[model samples]
Target: YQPNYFLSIPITNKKITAGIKVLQNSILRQDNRLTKAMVGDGSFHITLLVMQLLNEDEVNIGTDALLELKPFVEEILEGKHLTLPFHGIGTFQGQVGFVKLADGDHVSALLEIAETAKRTFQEKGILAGESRTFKPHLTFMKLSKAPMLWKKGVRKIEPGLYEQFIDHRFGEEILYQIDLCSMLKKKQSNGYYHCESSIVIGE
Candidate 1:
C-alpha cells in the first residue's frame, strides 16, 4: 500500500496558537458541523509559488541560504513587525476573497528565495517546477454555499473576516521544511480533506 503524502509551510508555535484561536472563533464557530476530522493531518499545503524539488548541489546551496535566513525568520517569530502589502482584490473559488500581493516587494523576495532554491536544484541536475506568478494571501475559510443576504446598499460581506486578521496585529516569519506532497481527498459531505506531512519551521 502507498502511504499518503503532503506539503506545507510550517508556522511558529505562537502563530499556530493564534491561528487555532482564529480558526475556532471565526471559522469553526460559523460551521459547527465542521469537526476536527475535517482538519488536515497537521499539515498545510505549501504555496505552489515557493515549491521546488532540490538536486544534490542545489540542496547544498539551498540549505546554506535557508540557514542564513533562519535568524531573520526567527526574529519575525519573536514578535517583530513585517508588513506584506497587497494591491488588487481577487476571489478563490468564489468562496475566499483576498487582496493580491503579486507585485509586492515581500512577495517578490519570497519568490526570489524560491527561485534560488530552484536554481540550486538545477545546478545539481534535478528538475523542478518553475516559479510562476501567483497571488499571496492568508487563507480565511471556505465560502458558504448559500448566497449571503446583505443589508441595504451593502457592497461587501458583513463582519468582515479579514478585519480580524488586520486588527490582531501579529507577524511571524516561517521557514518551511518540505518533506511530503499530495492532493487532498474529497469527503462524502463535499468537504476537502487536506493531506500533507511536515515538521516545525526550525525543527
Candidate 2:
C-alpha cells in the first residue's frame, strides 16, 4: 500500500543544508531543467518508516506510537550521542540523488532506531514499514518529484553533473527530533512537512 505518513528525522543542521544547496546549484548549472526535480532545502529529512494512516483513528494510533517510540530510541542510545555524518553522493538507480551516510557505529544505531519505529507502529496495529532494507541517505533530488522531466527526456540524473561531489563531506546532524508527518498535506511555511506529532531526543 502507498504510505500516507512517515516518521521523519528533519535535517535541521544549517551546515548540511547549505552544503546541499551548493551541490544543488552546481547540478542546476549543468542542467537547469533539473530545477523542478530538486528537493526543497526546507523539506530535507531522513525517513525512518512509512505508514498508511487512513483515518483519524489510525493517525491517532500512529501518533501514540511515535510518542511511545522515544523511550525505545533513548534506550537504544543509552545516553550516548547519535551523530550522523553525511559524506559523498549516491543515487538510487540513477533516478534519485542523495548524500550518503558515513559509515560508523551511528549507522547501526540508526538502523536500530528504524527497526524499533517499525515494530512500535506495527505493535500498535498501524500499517507501517517497507520491505526495502533501510539505507539511510539524505535525498537531494528525485525524478519522481517532477514527472514532467520524462516528457523532456530527462528520465534520470546524470552522474557527471554531481561527480565532483561524489566524495564531498556535507556535514553532520545530531539526532534531535522525530516528527510524524503527512505526505499529502500542505507543507509548513518554512517548507517542512506538516507534522502530526514530534518527540525530542537527547539534549
Candidate 3:
C-alpha cells in the first residue's frame, strides 16, 4: 500500500544532526544535483512502521494505537536506555543512502519495538507495517525523494560519493519519543513531518 502516515523515531540529538549535516554537505559537494536527494536535518528520523490513515477518524485511531504502544514499549525496554549508535553507511539497491546502526543488543530491542508496533496498530484494524523485514536505517538521502533526479539519470547513489563516511560514527541517541506523522501534509516550520501525536518513552 502507498502509506500516508507512519510511526517515527525522530533523531533529535545535536551531535547526530551535526554529523549528518556534514555528511550531507560532503555528498552535495561531489554532485551538486544531489542537493534534492538529501534528507533535511529537521526531518531526520528512523521509521518504525508505515500505515494508511484515510481520514481524520482513522488518524485518531492511529494516535490511540501509538498511545497504547507506550506501556508495551516500557515493558520491553524495562528500565534500560535504548541507545542507538549510528555508524558507517549503507544503501538499498543504491537508491537510498543511510547511516548504519552499529551492532549491539540495541538492534534487537529496536526490532522487538518494531514488531510490537506492527501488532499494536494491526490490532487496531489499521493496515500497518511493511511486508519486508524491518531493517532500521537512518536515511541520509534518497534518490526517489527527488523526482527530477530520475529524469536526470541519477537513479542510484554511488557509494563513492559517501565513501569518506563509510565507517564514520554519527553518534548515538537515547530513544526518547515516537511520533505519528503525516506524509502528505505540509511539514512543520522546522521541517519535521506534521505530527498527529507523540508518546514520550522514558527519562
Top model number, lDDT: 2
Ranking by lDDT: 2, 3, 1
lDDT of 1 by residue, 1-203 (tens): 22222223433345543554454356446544433322332432234323343344554443444445445444434543333433333456545543344343456555554455445444544454343454445443333422332222323333344445433433444455533343434432322233233333353
Ranking by TM-score, best first?
2, 3, 1
Cα RMSD for candidates in order: 9.2, 0.9, 1.1
> Model 3, which residues run further than 4 Å from truth?
none
Residue 121 in model 1: lDDT: 40
Predicted structure with the largest TM-score when compared to the true one: 2
In the range 44-107, model 2's lDDT, one tens digit per residue, is 9999899999999999999999999999999999899899999999999999999999999999
TM-score result, candidate 3: 0.96
Tens-place lDDT digits, model 3, residues 89-137: 9999999989998999999999999999999999999999998988999
Model 2 pairs whose backbones collide: none
Which window of 10 residues has the lowest lDDT sum in candidate 1?
A: 145-154
- Backbone clash total, candidate 1: 3
